[PDB]
Design a binder for this molecule. Structure first.
Ligand SMILES: *[C@H]1O[C@H](CO)[C@@H](O)[C@H](O)[C@@H]1O
Length: 323
C-alpha cells in the first residue's frame, strides 16, 4: 500500500517502544529507532539460550543471504549485538519491501536476552550510517519511500499507552492544529535539527538547541547548563551518583520544559519529567545530561508529547501537539 500505520506500545516507565512487524514469514516486535540505520532481529541463528522467550526470525524460502556481510552494534552500557545478513520481505502496517536487508543476530548481550518483549531494531535514520560491512545496506524507509503517497513517516509515541507510526501520510486525528517544519541536518546520518529557543517553566531563553530526534533514546538529553538550570527549579533535586543522574523527592513539583520551533511550542509536561521511582521516596528525572555525546538528544521523554513528521524531502522535521 502507498500508506500504512502501525501501533507502538511502551514498556515499563516508557523505557522503550515496541512495534510488531513481519520479517519473512515471522512476526516479531521491534524497536523503531530514528537514531539507527540498521534493522536487526533475534533469529534462528541466535543461540537458543540467548533467544529464549523471544519471537524470532527464521530465514526461509524467501530469504536471500548476502554472503560475506556482517554487522555489529555496540551500546553505551556495554550491550552489543552482531551477526550476518539476509534480504527478505519486511512488512510494516501494509507497507512492504520484498528484499529488505535483515541483519540476523548470531549473538546478543544478556540485557537483550532479558528484554523478552524486544526482538530487534528497525532503524529509521539515514542509510549513510548503516553498519553492515563490507557494503552498507539501505534502510526500510529508504527502500519504500518512493512507493509512498508522500516520502514521509510520522511518530506519535504516548505515555503509558498505545501510540502510532504513520508511513506515507499524516493522520489528522492524532494531532491538533497545523504541522510546523524545520530543516534537517543529516550530515551525521541522524534526523538532526535546531530548536529556535526553549523555556524552563515560564522562563524562556532566546538560545537555540541543536540535537537529533531519536525514538530509540529514552530520555531528553541536554547541555549541562540547561539540565542544571532545570533542576535548580526543582526543590530537593540533586545529582545521584549511584543512579547516574538527577533525582528528586517523588512529590516534588516539576516545571514543564518546552522548545520553540518556528511559531510552535513543543511542550514536555512536568508529569513526563518524573521518569522512574528509584526508591527511598526519590524519582529519577526525565531530563538528563548529554555529556559525552556532544549534542542533544530529543528522546522518548520529549517525543511522547508530540506528533513528529520525518520528511525525506528537504529533509525536514515537522511538529504538532498530540490530540
Ligand atoms: C494509508 O493511508 C491512506 C490515507 O488515510 C489510505 O487512503 C490508505 O488506504 C492507507 O490506509
Amino acid at each position: 500500500a502507498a500508506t500504512g500505520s502501525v501501533t507502538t506500545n511502551p514498556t515499563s516507565n516508557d523505557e522503550e517502544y515496541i512495534t510488531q512487524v513481519t520479517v519473512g514469514d515471522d512476526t516479531l516486535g521491534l524497536d523503531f529507532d530514528t537514531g539507527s540505520a540498521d534493522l536487526w532481529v533475534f533469529s534462528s541463528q541466535t543461540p537458543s539460550s540467548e533467544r529464549s522467550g523471544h519471537d524470532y526470525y527464521t530465514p526461509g524460502s524467501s530469504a536471500q543471504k548476502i554472503d560475506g556481510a556482517t554487522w555489529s552494534i555496540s551500546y553505551g552500557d556495554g550491550s552489543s549485538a552482531s551477526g550476518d545478513v539476509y534480504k527478505d520481505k519486511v512488512t510494516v502496517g501494509g507497507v512492504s519491501y520484498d528484499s529488505q536487508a535483515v541483519e540476523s543476530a548470531e549473538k546478543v548481550s544478556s540485557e537483550f536476552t532479558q528484554d523478552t518483549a524486544n526482538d530487534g531494531l528497525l532503524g529509521l535514520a539515514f542509510s549513510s550510517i548503516n553498519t553492515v560491512q563490507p557494503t552498507p545496506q539501505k534502510t526500510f524507509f529508504d527502500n519504500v519511500k518512493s512507493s509512498l503517497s508522500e516520502p514521509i513517516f510520522a511518530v506519535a509515541l504516548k505515555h503509558n499507552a498505545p501510540g502510532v507510526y504513520d508511513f506515507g501520510y499524516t493522520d489528522s486525528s492524532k494531532y491538533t492544529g497545523s504541522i510546523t517544519y524545520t530543516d534537517v541536518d543529516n550530515s551525521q546520518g541522524f534526523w538532526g535539527f535546531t530548536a529556535d529557543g526553549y523555556s524552563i517553566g515560564s522562563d524562556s531563553s532566546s538560545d537555540s538547541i541543536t540535537g537529533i530526534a531519536d525514538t530509540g533514546t529514552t530520555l531528553l538529553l541536554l547541555d549541562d547548563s540547561i539540565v542544571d538550570a532545570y533542576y535548580e527549579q526543582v526543590n530537593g533535586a540533586s545529582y545521584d551518583s549511584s543512579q547516574g543522574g538527577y533525582v528528586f523527592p517523588s512529590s516534588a513539583s516539576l516545571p514543564d520544559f518546552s522548545v520553540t520551533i518556528g511559531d510552535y511550542t513543543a511542550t514536555v509536561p512536568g508529569e513526563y519529567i518524573s521518569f522512574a521511582d528509584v526508591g527511598n521516596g526519590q524519582t529519577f528525572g526525565g531530563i538528563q545530561s548529554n555529556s559525552g555525546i556532544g549534542f542533544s538528544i530529543f528522546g522518548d521523554v520529549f517525543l511522547k508529547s508530540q506528533y513528529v513528521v520525518f520528511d525525506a524531502s528537504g529533509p525536514r522535521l515537522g511538529f504538532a501537539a498530540q490530540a
